Amino acid sequence: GSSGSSGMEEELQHSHCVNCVSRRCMTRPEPGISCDLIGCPLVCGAVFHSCKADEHRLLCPFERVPCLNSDFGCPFTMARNKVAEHLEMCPASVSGPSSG
Ligand SMILES: [Zn+2]
Ligand SMILES: [Zn+2]
Ligand SMILES: [Zn+2]
Ligand SMILES: [Zn+2]
């Protein structure tokens, strides 16, 4: 009788990608140096390396983000850029039409 398993997942950064700002990069994707490029899954309008994506999302505006005033308790959620349209009619904005 016996029993046992094996398997270890681990990935590192890409020397190339890590140093690749150009969105329209066309460098042969090498296993260890540079990976294939992929367009944002939110059609935000940016081209980054599949590996960078994870990081890009952090910046990408489209990325689903909670109301700027999430602290107050706004159950609303939308793109970082589409936060205004909501903030205008948002309760956690305490911003009246006060004009002149
Ligand atoms: Zn690149
Ligand atoms: Zn990469
Ligand atoms: Zn994006
Ligand atoms: Zn809100």
Gap from CA of 47 to ligand 3 centroid (Å) = 8
- Ligand 3 mean position, distance from CA 97 (Å): 33
Ligand 3 centroid distance, CA of 87 (Å): 22
| Burial (Cβ within 10 Å: 0-12, 13-18, ≥19) of residue 92 | middle
Rg (CA), the chain: 21
Handedness of CA 15, 19, 24, 26 (dihedral sign): negative
Residue 8 lies in a domain: no
Per DSSP, the residues of 19-75 read G---TT------TTT---EEE-TT--S-EEEHHHHHHHHHH-SSSEEE-TTTTTT--
**75 shares a domain with 55:** no
2 within a domain of the structure (yes/no): no
Same domain, 25 and 54: yes
Query: 57 and 25 share a domain?
Result: yes
Partnered with residue 49 across adjacent β-strands are: 37
Residues 27, 20 contacting (CB under 8 angstroms): yes
Rounded distance from Cα 16 to ligand 2 centre (Å)? 7
Distance CA 71, CA 67 (A): 9
47 plus 71 within the same structural domain: no
Measured CA to CA, the distance from residue 87 to residue 70 in angstroms comes to 11
Read off the CATH number of the domain in which 19 is found.
3.30.40.150
Q: How close is the Cα of 88 to the center of ligand 4, in Å?
A: 9
Give CA separation, 28 vs 6, 75, 98, in Å.
Answer: 32, 44, 57
- Owning domain of residue 24: 13-62
Nearest to 38 by CA among 22, 27, 26, 49: 49
66 - beta bridge partners? 77
Same domain, 75 and 54: no
Give the contacts of 79 (CB within 8 A, at least 6 positions apart): 42, 61, 62, 63, 64, 65
Residue 90, CA distances (Å) to 6, 62, 64, 82, 100 in order: 52, 19, 17, 12, 22
* Residue 17 alpha carbon to ligand 1 centre in Å: 5
| C-alpha 41 to ligand 2 mean position (Å) | 16
Residue 81 lies in a domain: yes
7 located within any domain:
no
Which technique was used to obtain these atomic coordinates?
NMR
Residues 20 and 50 in one domain: yes
